[PDB]
Structure 1
């Protein structure tokens, strides 16, 4: 589910699943 175009809520969900308890940061305007 990681190797594709991930945008918006779809990208946020991938980060949630991959990072787990470590958490993550989402910066659209980077």
Structure 2
């Protein structure tokens, strides 16, 4: 799949694809 680090805007795009119709929550605090 992606045996890889996903940071910044690449993480939120991964979430966007993976989650689909559901949606997601991004919290870059910790």
Q: How many residues align?
A: 30
More strand by share: 2
More helix by share: 1
Identify unmatched segments of 5+ residues in structure 1: none
Structure 1 moving runs of 4+ over 4 Å: none
Identify unmatched segments of 5+ residues in structure 2: none
C-alpha RMSD over aligned residues? 1.2
